[PDB]
Amino acid sequence: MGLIAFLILIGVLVWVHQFGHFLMAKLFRVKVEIFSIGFGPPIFRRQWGETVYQIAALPLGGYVKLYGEEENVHDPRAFSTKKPWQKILIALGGPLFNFLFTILVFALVYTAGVEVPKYLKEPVVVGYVQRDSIAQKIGIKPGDKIIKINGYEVRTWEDLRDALIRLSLDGVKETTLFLERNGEVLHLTIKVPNVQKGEELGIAPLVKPVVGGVKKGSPADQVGIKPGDLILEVNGKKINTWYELVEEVRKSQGKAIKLKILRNGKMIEKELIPAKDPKTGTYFIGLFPKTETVVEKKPFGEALASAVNRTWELTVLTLKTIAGLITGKVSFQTLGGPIAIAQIAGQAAQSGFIPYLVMMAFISLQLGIFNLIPLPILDGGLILLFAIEWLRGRPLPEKFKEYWQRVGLAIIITLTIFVFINDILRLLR
């Protein structure tokens, strides 16, 4: 399912891009001949008038051949004879179509309802502080409500995450933090963690003390703790947060534990021995927290507006990532090669189809942004070539044209091999 899902994803993406190219071209009286999808020997081709469609064997890329692109043909249907601005529009049609596709699928997903954890929308209340972390070190007591950082005013945990990732990308270190408790806005000087590489603020949201799953073969499974049941107390200790149950289990360290479980309206004093698991010398109970999720369905117009906003935010984030990469801020190992695309597509497919759709939107946006950079033998380089010819009024020298095309082919090839070996390195771990 994974490999075929990756294949169909790459196929629909390249088809959308080349179809945008083709429709923009047909809206300007040109003749298209090759509609090659991918590379290698064409697996099968069907002819319909001038437009001969084919599909090839190796689906990595895809390119389209027109009539009179750069040849010295004076026929009106020749692409070379066309005005430079129309050629620029033809070049931009691809990424523009990709962006339109991403916005449309995002809006469709939003209208169909997205499933998100409920804590992602509730007000920012710190239900648990990680021990000896930045939040604890600065002095964030549990139950404190964060109202502002730097910037981006925060009201939802999603807003806090977005502000944190933006601050990490911006390379800010010391940040003013307006935190509220008992009507006191206590300004603090927080240290922004490099959330790009994993480290976080050590702030946890409120989580109800209820079990949603149990590992089969776990001692809790042998005791009889079925999933979907809430737990009242542990050894009589008043606990109102699942993280407090986690703390109690962590401090048990193998001691016999008497869990007062509220079994759907009745109290059971279950006895457990969560000893030090020989796998890591750690407490083992084989439990799963009960995750809570909500499905949202925005109004169609409001869904479209939200999709536009999200597309703008993701475009800004990708542009910032590109700028950081060109400045050395982010290492080259974070690039996503086609094999990484395959593995993440398989992960999305096994996750579901709506996650598959949103990941398709994100990767389509990534492809559209990538194909816009100024680079020979790319959907962005020809824009630069035609703009140069337009501003100077004459075509680029033919020898310079050959040099430009050759160096572009070389750099594309070498970067593809580099990202390929990066993919193999990722596969190794």
């Epitope: 000896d132 972390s133 070190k137 002095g139």
Partner: antibody
Framework: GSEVKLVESGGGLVQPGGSLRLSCVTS????????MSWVRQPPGKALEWLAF??????????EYRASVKGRFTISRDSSQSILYLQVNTLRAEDSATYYC?????????????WGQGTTLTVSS | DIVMTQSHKFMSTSVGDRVSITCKAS??????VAWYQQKPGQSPKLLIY???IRHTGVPDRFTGSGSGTDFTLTISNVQSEDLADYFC?????????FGAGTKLELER
């Protein structure tokens, strides 16, 4: 302002069974905002963490290595940026270089700035 | 408690080469690991924390990697000012523990 600076004092030769207090004078940073520790470095042996003390907002609580609890005491001065470490019942195994250190604010205590260290020799 | 085991007490290298210093934890510590450098007669100096985050002011030659139990400090393009002792440290659980250290020896 001045850069981070830590200077230890109180080392020297001390007979077994005695007591003394080591000092660490700090400068260049707000003293009450950072964890302080007394990790030790014996000659040609690995580092041994001894204790650390939390900030003002955390009640100045202390954490100790189990082997030295009840023997070693870490503390801060009331009105000066000076850290102290009282040590009693000294034995020959305590002879080492004692380092005072300022920790970063990241996740979990690590030591971002170290003092020069002071050498203690315990023998009769 | 948690024991940080550096299998090599000495490691040979030349100026301009790459060195990989290994460190093995007694149990899973995730990524709560820091690395330090100590030159003769000087205090230790933190280079990397969280397995892969370079400290401010540390040159790009020092890189850390690894997760779980087999963390590694790689020094690309060894310069002459790197002849020193390098050791790891974990802060996943108390008490905090250090490695025994690794001394850089020059080849000839």
């Amino acid at each position: 302002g001045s850069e981070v600076k830590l200077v230890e004092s109180g080392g020297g030769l001390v007979q077994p069974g005695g007591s003394l207090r080591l000092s660490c004078v700090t400068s260049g940073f707000t003293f009450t905002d950072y964890y302080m520790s007394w990790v030790r470095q014996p000659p040609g042996k690995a580092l041994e963490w001894l204790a650390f003390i939390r900030n003002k907002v955390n009640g100045y609580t202390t954490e100790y290595r189990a082997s030295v609890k009840g023997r070693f005491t870490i503390s801060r001065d009331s009105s000066q940026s000076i850290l102290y470490l009282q040590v009693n019942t000294l034995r020959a195994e305590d002879s080492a270089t004692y380092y005072c250190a300022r920790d970063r604010g990241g996740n979990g205590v690590y030591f971002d700035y170290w003092g020069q260290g002071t050498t203690l020799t315990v023998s009769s | 408690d948690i024991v940080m085991t550096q299998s090599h007490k000495f490691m040979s290298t030349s100026v301009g080469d790459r060195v990989s210093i290994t460190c093995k934890a007694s149990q899973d510590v995730g990524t709560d690991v820091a690395w330090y450098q100590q030159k003769p007669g000087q205090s230790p100096k933190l280079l990397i924390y969280w397995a892969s985050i370079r400290h401010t002011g540390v040159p790009d030659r020092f890189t850390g990697s690894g997760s779980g139990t087999d963390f590694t400090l790689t020094i690309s393009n060894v310069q002459s000012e790197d002849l020193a002792d390098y050791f790891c440290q974990q802060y996943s659980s108390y008490p905090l523990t250090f490695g025994a250290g690794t001394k850089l020896e020059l080849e000839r």
